[PDB]
Design a protein around this ligand. Sequence first.
Ligand SMILES: *Cc1c(COP(=O)(O)O)cnc(C)c1O
Ligand SMILES: *Cc1c(COP(=O)(O)O)cnc(C)c1O
Lengths: 392, 392
Amino acid sequence: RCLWNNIAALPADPIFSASLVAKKAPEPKADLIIGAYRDAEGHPYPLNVVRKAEQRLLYLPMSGYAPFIEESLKIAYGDSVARENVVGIQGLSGTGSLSIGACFLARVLSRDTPVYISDPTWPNHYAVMAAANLTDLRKYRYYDNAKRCIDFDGLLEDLNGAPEGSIVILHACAHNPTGMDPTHEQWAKILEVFQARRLIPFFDSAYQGYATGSLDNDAYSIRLFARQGMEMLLAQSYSKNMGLYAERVGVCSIVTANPKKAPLIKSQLETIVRSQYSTPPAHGARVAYLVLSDPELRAGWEQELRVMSTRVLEMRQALYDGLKRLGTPGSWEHIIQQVGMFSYLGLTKAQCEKLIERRVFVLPSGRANMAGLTKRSVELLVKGIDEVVRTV
Amino acid sequence: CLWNNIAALPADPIFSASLVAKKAPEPKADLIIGAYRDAEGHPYPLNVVRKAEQRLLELPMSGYAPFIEESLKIAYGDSVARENVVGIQGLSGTGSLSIGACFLARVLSRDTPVYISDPTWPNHYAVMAAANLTDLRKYRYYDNAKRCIDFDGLLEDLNGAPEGSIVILHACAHNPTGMDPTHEQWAKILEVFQARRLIPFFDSAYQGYATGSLDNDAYSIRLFARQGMEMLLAQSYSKNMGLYAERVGVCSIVTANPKKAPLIKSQLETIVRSQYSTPPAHGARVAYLVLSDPELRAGWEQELRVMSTRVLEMRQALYDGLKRLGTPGSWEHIIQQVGMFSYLGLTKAQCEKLIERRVFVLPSGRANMAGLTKRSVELLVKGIDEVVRTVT
Ligand SMILES: *Cc1c(COP(=O)(O)O)cnc(C)c1O
Ligand SMILES: *Cc1c(COP(=O)(O)O)cnc(C)c1O
């Protein structure tokens, strides 16, 4: 007898292997899997202001460190709704905050509630929903691989098919892995569907401040839905926009249309966090609270974020410029319409396989970490893409 | 309003009371938190951990393999061959427990009955429910009025369990009562497991705390594993190393068929992705140094021995004091109990009256015994003698 005889084969981790290849590859190379950042997830090192806050930092309820929760709600919702319509609790980073929200949705609605997920998405979305036992997982078309844009007609078709009450996982800004976000107009069309079909937004905000370098503008989609009266969930991470991965800083929040339901939501969320931590991680919350609340730290963080987003846009611009100059076949407009640190380069699996023999390392999906590119590496990437497009 | 029928829940039974204890005037005995960091009883790092942190200054998805190996070694020793064990990192005890719960939910069924001791560490229910184990059941464990393990009711409830039921076992230092099965009792418990094909899911948060001997505290884990039975184990280092801030834990699965280990491992790795996007390396490295380095290991073991001796001495002082006063009732449970927490044996009304003498215990008679001192134990002796003789 063996309890586990049916455990079921799973495909192996694509990224981990390929990541080691790029790392333990010679030296004359362009690593766009990990590179300058710390993992293939793209966690950066603590930002300058975060380090200042760590230094300057020299009895919690289960929901966690309330000053941090309040600042986290502020940066996300920005007065789009009244405070009494908002409930927040600490999560262990983005992943923990997603799982809190997913377990909350599973407990208060139903584990059989359909969840729509973008095609493609951040891969561990599936792992989070499965751990919550959200078993009815569906795709909405998102990236159009042929036209190198958001398949917005497909997206709207799939969401217009969503059963009422379906959960939709939404990337707040800097869609991962494509780097391509809806326009404001597209968000308006999306919102109309949510409203007509009474779908449940579940916003994933891991990059507020990365997309445009503007916290407010990056929050457009969250605030559009909240302000127009949508009830919804939000998972916030600070692992990327502050570099606080090790301290596991995040918030899961719920928007209620009825403020009298808020204490009930809060208690339900508090028993859920108990499945995640026995004591709220106070230290990372105190650090983030200080970056958020202190005017001088807050100003320096907003500025470093603005610096990063213009830099990455610059590199994208150089990439596109190099591809136009070489006459590389295809549309390359998507390269300068993308934001955040990941971009879908627009290549086929086969073209990506050949790039990795140039020691230009991207994922086989065409995902490139575009932060960390230098004028030298972007020109290697120009020549590499131009070669594989023409010969593969 | 989606959140209209959210079930009302009871208030946190510790948080408010712990505040009353911390805010009360200085001549007092705080047996809720005291000198420990929080209400769960997480200590500051032991000295060997501090020394490990210092020496450290001189992946894949499952985590830091040498940590996992030493963690399994200390738990299982000679009771099971290495090829029958699969282990992954979890975020402390809670995370490790969640991984195991989600694994069982995934590979067996979410409807699989889960038996949980009455009383238990409260967050067990929240871990199991977040994994969406929906059939949670009590087994009788402690009879508060009799001040002993209700061993006839315990065995009765497990004999009533359906075959394949999951049972959450406290490996040692049962929380919150402090009362563990004897070795003979553990074997009578194992008999029911063996006869009824029950699935042990051990929770080991106090290995080395209970008795100061890592090997002796693993008795029950090793009694069951040396049978060849399949089981799960969640290990925390938050309490016996004081490493809560580093979220160090291990979930292991025992498989009777080594060939299934690769599949088990892949399943676990999918599951940890609901919990963290990159494993908590630093605490694994710290723990690994404590576990494997001859000097640090030996010093860690000495600190554990001293800690357990110290708390036994405080229990013995309390018992001796109540005996000298002739306080009514049986007080043997005081010196039979182990670990940081004790059920002192008081009624709710006796506990309420102790609070007016500023001796703060939970109304469930639970006291953190480990922060007691010669000074404070003498106040507890007199408070207990008082409320026993004068209430109800
Ligand atoms: C990074 C990321 C997460 C998870 O955040 P972590 O903090 O690393 O746990 C979730 N969703 C998306 C879209 C991300 O990019
Ligand atoms: C303390 C405790 C835990 C949780 O471990 P953490 O490291 O704090 O998450 C789990 N189970 C039991 C029985 C405990 O006493």
